[PDB]
Amino acid sequence: PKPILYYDERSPPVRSCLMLIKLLDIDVELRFVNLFKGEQFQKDFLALNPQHSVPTLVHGDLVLTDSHAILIHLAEKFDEGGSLWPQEHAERMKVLNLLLFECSFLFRRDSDFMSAIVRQGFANVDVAHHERKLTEAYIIMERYLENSDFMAGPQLTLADLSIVTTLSTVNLMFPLSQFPRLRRWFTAMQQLDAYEANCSGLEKLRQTMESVGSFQFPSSSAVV
Amino acid sequence: PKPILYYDERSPPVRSCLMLIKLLDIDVELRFVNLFKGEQFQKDFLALNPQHSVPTLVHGDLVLTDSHAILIHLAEKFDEGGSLWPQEHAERMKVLNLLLFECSFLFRRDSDFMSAIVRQGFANVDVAHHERKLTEAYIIMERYLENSDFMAGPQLTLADLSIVTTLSTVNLMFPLSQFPRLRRWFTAMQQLDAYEANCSGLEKLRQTMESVGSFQFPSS
Ligand SMILES: CC1(C)CC(=O)C(SC[C@H](NC(=O)CC[C@H](N)C(=O)O)C(=O)NCC(=O)O)C(=O)C1
Ligand SMILES: CC1(C)CC(=O)C(SC[C@H](NC(=O)CC[C@H](N)C(=O)O)C(=O)NCC(=O)O)C(=O)C1
């Protein structure tokens, strides 16, 4: 039975799942949930996922409500024995650790910045505060990449897919000029065919945020 | 060599690891990092974990910087064939999904509330706003418990360990009186021998928060 993905492509964690789906050529039914219209509070969706969040995957009787679980599940099912979710324990733990960095640190900070803009309007956000928090994330990722060309090791893993969608979102606002390894990695990611799955949603998010927040991102910032 | 855990027992994600260490009889070397003194920014610790967070586990050459990775790693190395981290794919994914709920939703919201107290003082926190956000988490967990005695199924898993430490922390402020499944589950968790590993740190957090936030929890 084909997996069903409830999605809003503006969302970075949704885009990571879209990227994996494209990378592994997985047949998935897409069901759109417009977050800015509050459709995630529809009684049926709420009953499916009380966290009212996307992505949400329905695959048979399995209901997953977090991009990182979805990434791992899809890797184990459509890339069984593969290197995206490595077979060797230490390597798999490294990937898991970076998936969790994306959730706990990078996404948390980007979400709190972007959500502030949605709630308060850009002109009323302490942008310098968020610049510091997100620059700190850039410095961390630069440190990770000083040892390897991918986030969790020498090969592409789920961690790269998870991190690149949020990094691309942070970089709508904050430039990467001071971060040579991060620039190299991001450019490499942009060369993947799977990266196309990031584009529509990133641009939609850009346009949506500028509308709701009443501002423009500096065009010079985004690496393209 | 044996695992080294950098820890501050006030931290909910530290306490889940302490619970697992007790549950599985794991021999670990503990190293205290006092977050309220900013010791997580000490040069050597920062070099080890640029996220300046606890728990951090060093196990040989493996450095883990997230409690959920630590729980999974320790279960895989020290509890092969156990039920805490089920080997059947669907069951494992359910546990993983709940671990990620704890990280992404429950802990995020509790951390935001508690940090607001630290930074603003309790008297200056929008408590109603946080009560709404955290009560929402209670509601969600009440739902998760509808078909089973534990968070991820009929048996105790890593998910319960991760969730109970944060839930016990939210419960410093907000009672479980309206949530019968959740209150039943929390009472059951408190009966586990391993839950003793949560006690010291929870109380230390209560005391630290009340001092730093210039207030007293209702539960105090
Ligand atoms: C403005 C912005 C960027 C704020 C956001 O946080 C997002 S992402 C959409 C959000 N999804 C999650 O929070 C899932 C995070 C999990 N850790 C994961 O799946 O990895 C969401 O569904 N929000 C809806 C809601 O909370 O009501 C965004 O898209 C907009
Ligand atoms: C005031 C309070 C409750 C705020 C907190 O957030 C904590 S928990 C300590 C914190 N640890 C993490 O943020 C790890 C979260 C990961 N997702 C995980 O391991 O599961 C921490 O180290 N903070 C220090 C810092 O950020 O500088 C707490 O203890 C105090």
- In order, the DSSP letters of A145-159 are HTS-SBTTBSS--HH
Q: Looking at the DSSP assignment, which residues form a beta bridge with residue A57?
A: A5, A64
Q: For B56, phi and psi rounded to 5 degrees?
A: -130, 130
Q: Coil, helix or strand for B59?
A: strand
Given the CA of residue A70, which atom of ligand 1 is nearest to it? 19
- Which residues lie below 8 Å from residue A178, measured CB to CB, with a gap of 6+? A138
Please state, in angstroms and rounded to a whole number, the distance separating the CA atoms of residues B103 and A97. Answer: 13
Pairing label, strands B4-7, A62-64: unpaired
How many CB atoms neighbour CB A125 within 10 A?
A: 19
- DSSP H or E segment with residue B5: strand B4-7
Please state, in angstroms and rounded to a whole number, the distance separating the CA atoms of residues B179 and B176. Answer: 5
Which residue from A189, A190, A191, A224 is spatially nearest to A206, judged by alpha carbons?
A224
Strands, E assignment, B17-148: 29-32, 56-59, 62-64
- DSSP H or E segment with residue B87: none
Going by the DSSP 8-state scheme, the letter that residue A6 receives in this structure is E
Please state, in angstroms and rounded to a whole number, the distance separating the CA atoms of residues A168 and A224. Answer: 10
Please state, in angstroms and rounded to a whole number, the distance separating the CA atoms of residues B78 and B57. Answer: 14
A43 to chain B, any CB pair closer than 8 A? The answer is no
Q: For A57, phi and psi rounded to 5 degrees?
A: -115, 135
For tokens 């492509």, the residue is A9
Is residue B12 a contact partner of residue B167, using CB atoms and an 8 Å limit? no
Bond into A3 cis (ω within 30): no
Q: For B81, phi and psi rounded to 5 degrees?
A: 80, 0
Asked if A143's CB is within 8 angstroms of B93's CB, the reply is no
Going by the DSSP 8-state scheme, the letter that residue A106 receives in this structure is I
Please state, in angstroms and rounded to a whole number, the distance separating the CA atoms of residues A115 and A112. Answer: 5
CA angle A99, A100, A105 (to 5 degrees): 115
Please state, in angstroms and rounded to a whole number, the distance separating the CA atoms of residues B76 and B78. Answer: 6
**Shortest-distance ligand to the CA of residue B12:** 2
Q: Round the CA-based radius of gyration of chain B to a whole number and report it.
A: 17
Probe ligand 1: pick from A53, A65, A170, A211, max atoms within 8 Å of CB? A53
Please state, in angstroms and rounded to a whole number, the distance separating the CA atoms of residues B198 and B15. Answer: 5
Asked if B62's CB is within 8 angstroms of A139's CB, the reply is no
Q: Coil, helix or strand for B118?
A: helix
CA angle A37, A40, A42 (to 5 degrees): 95
Neighbour-count burial for A129-165, b at 16+ CB within 10 Å, e otherwise: ebeeebeebbebbbebbeeeebbbbeebbbbbbbbbb
- Going by CA atoms, what residue is nearest to atom 13 of ligand 1? A53
Q: Coil, helix or strand for A54?
A: coil
C-alpha torsion sign, points A142, A146, A150, A152: negative
CA A224 from centroid of its chain's CA atoms: 17
Going by the DSSP 8-state scheme, the letter that residue A103 receives in this structure is I
CA angle B206, B212, B214 (to 5 degrees): 90
How many CB atoms neighbour CB B51 within 10 A?
A: 19
Tokens at B5, concatenated: 């855990």
CA distance B207 to chain A (A): 26
Please state, in angstroms and rounded to a whole number, the distance separating the CA atoms of residues B15 and B195. Answer: 9
Q: Coil, helix or strand for A4?
A: strand
- Which residues lie below 8 Å from residue A125, measured CB to CB, with a gap of 6+? A113, A116, A117
Cross-chain CB nearest to B96 (options A53, A72, A143):
A72
Q: For A201, phi and psi rounded to 5 degrees?
A: -70, -40
Going by the DSSP 8-state scheme, the letter that residue B79 receives in this structure is -
A90 to chain B, any CB pair closer than 8 A? The answer is yes
- DSSP H or E segment with residue A7: strand A4-7
Bond into B55 cis (ω within 30): yes
- DSSP H or E segment with residue B105: none
Is residue A173 a contact partner of residue A223, using CB atoms and an 8 Å limit? no
B66 to chain A, any CB pair closer than 8 A? The answer is yes
Please state, in angstroms and rounded to a whole number, the distance separating the CA atoms of residues A24 and A70. Answer: 13
Tokens at B19, concatenated: 């619970």
Please state, in angstroms and rounded to a whole number, the distance separating the CA atoms of residues B25 and B38. Answer: 30
Please state, in angstroms and rounded to a whole number, the distance separating the CA atoms of residues B88 and A107. Answer: 30
- The answer to whether the CB of B208 is under 6 A from ligand 2 is no
- Which residues lie below 8 Å from residue A12, measured CB to CB, with a gap of 6+? A107, A110, A165, A166, A168, A169
Q: Coil, helix or strand for A134?
A: helix
Is residue B210 a contact partner of residue B196, using CB atoms and an 8 Å limit? no
- The answer to whether the CB of B13 is under 6 A from ligand 2 is yes
Asked if B62's CB is within 8 angstroms of A101's CB, the reply is no
Provide the phi-psi class of A66: left if phi over 0, else alpha when psi is between -120 and 50, else beta.
Answer: beta
Please state, in angstroms and rounded to a whole number, the distance separating the CA atoms of residues B114 and A187. Answer: 39
- Which residues lie below 8 Å from residue B164, measured CB to CB, with a gap of 6+? B16, B19, B186, B189, B195, B198
CA distance A41 to chain B (A): 13
